[PDB]
Design a protein around this ligand. Structure first.
Ligand SMILES: Cc1ccc(C(=O)NC2CC2)cc1-c1ccc(C(=O)NCC2CC2)cc1
Length: 349
């Protein structure tokens, strides 16, 4: 049964949304795309409404629209952003051309938390616990976040946390250039394209985030890719023979071999005053060889989280069929698939 929709101008375009959503107000300062906060009068929830920009203008846009909708429809986990609603004012596939995604709105991101608050060790435990609990779920569906950073960890007043923006990858070279947070949380294998990477890139990012909650300071605030790699290698040491062999980029291998060999530093001296259990977990996360990093499931059982860990309440995801990713389709075929997903949406309980 079709809701009645109303129109207003927001973010220099016409937003057309069901009446249940009231007091739309732009948020994010552009960062999360075209997102408005709203009040969902039907549920009493503060919601975030994302209007997809030009979702079917190219094959690339059409496929990424389908991708985002597929991802959100799948994720049903307390620590992972999920889909409250998805709609279009279109009454048929022919007229279908805008997609609006509705999620919970959290009051802040972690970037603002670590900037404006003092985090106790207990706050760090709880926050990192929740990130790993959400990542266990994401990783179990064979989704890689690839871009985990403080600004995509959404947090309410009770420090309850949801992970945003997983599996969408993105980013231009210019965006990754220079003294920029966009690059500081990236695993070096993906920063320098050493090899075909996998979900283990996300654990590096968690290590960088955790260290920063502990010290209040960016762990590897490189001024550029090369300066960042040097900051990283000073802390964790230069690669050994075994890791070198795994760098399939011959070019990248050759460069990294030009560097003066350095040993791994003592993490107790780097993280003075930190809980020894935090120091140990950092050591297990910040391993240069991605093969040897602790996994999210393993990390949840680490002694640092003894107060939060519950093995009966760390769920995994239902199978996520992402065979569409291998598929070459036309714009109108991606658009039809997206429409089927809009039409079949059933809201959460
Ligand atoms: C609305 C929306 C739609 C999609 C996605 C997403 O992650 N998609 C990728 C597929 C996973 C995210 C959102 C969204 C959810 C929450 C906030 C929020 O609370 N921001 C932090 C506070 C402002 C300080 C912003 C955007």
């Amino acid at each position: 049964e079709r809701p009645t929709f109303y129109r207003q101008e927001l973010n220099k375009t016409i937003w057309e949304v069901p009446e249940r959503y009231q007091n739309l107000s732009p948020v994010g300062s552009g960062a999360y795309g075209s997102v408005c906060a709203a009040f969902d009068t039907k549920t009493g929830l503060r919601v975030a409404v994302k209007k997809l920009s030009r979702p079917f203008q190219s094959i690339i846009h059409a496929k990424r629209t389908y991708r985002e909708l597929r991802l959100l429809k799948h994720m049903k986990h307390e620590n992972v952003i999920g889909l409250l609603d998805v709609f279009t004012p279109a009454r048929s596939l022919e007229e279908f051309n805008d997609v609006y995604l509705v999620t919970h709105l959290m009051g802040a991101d972690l970037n603002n938390i670590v900037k404006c608050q003092k985090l106790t060790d207990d706050h760090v435990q709880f926050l990192i616990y929740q990130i790993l609990r959400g990542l266990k779920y994401i990783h179990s569906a064979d989704i890689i976040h690839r871009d985990l950073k403080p600004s995509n960890l959404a947090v309410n007043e009770d420090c309850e946390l949801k992970i945003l923006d997983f599996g969408l990858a993105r980013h231009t070279d210019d965006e990754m250039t220079g003294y920029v947070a966009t690059r500081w949380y990236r695993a070096p294998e993906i920063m320098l394209n050493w090899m075909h990477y996998n979900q283990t890139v996300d654990i590096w990012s968690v290590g960088c985030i955790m260290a920063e909650l502990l010290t209040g300071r960016t762990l590897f605030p490189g001024t550029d890719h090369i300066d960042q790699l040097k900051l990283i290698l000073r802390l964790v040491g230069t690669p050994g023979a075994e890791l070198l062999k795994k760098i399939s980029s011959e070019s990248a291998r050759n460069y990294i071999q030009s560097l003066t060999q350095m040993p791994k530093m003592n993490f107790a001296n780097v993280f003075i005053g930190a809980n020894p259990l935090a120091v140990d977990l950092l050591e297990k996360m910040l391993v240069l060889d991605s093969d040897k990093r602790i996994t999210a499931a393993q990390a949840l059982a680490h002694a640092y989280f003894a107060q939060y860990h519950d093995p009966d309440d760390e769920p995994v995801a239902d199978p996520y069929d992402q065979s569409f990713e291998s598929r070459d389709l036309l714009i109108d075929e991606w658009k039809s698939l997206t429409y089927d997903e809009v039409i079949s949406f059933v809201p959460p309980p």
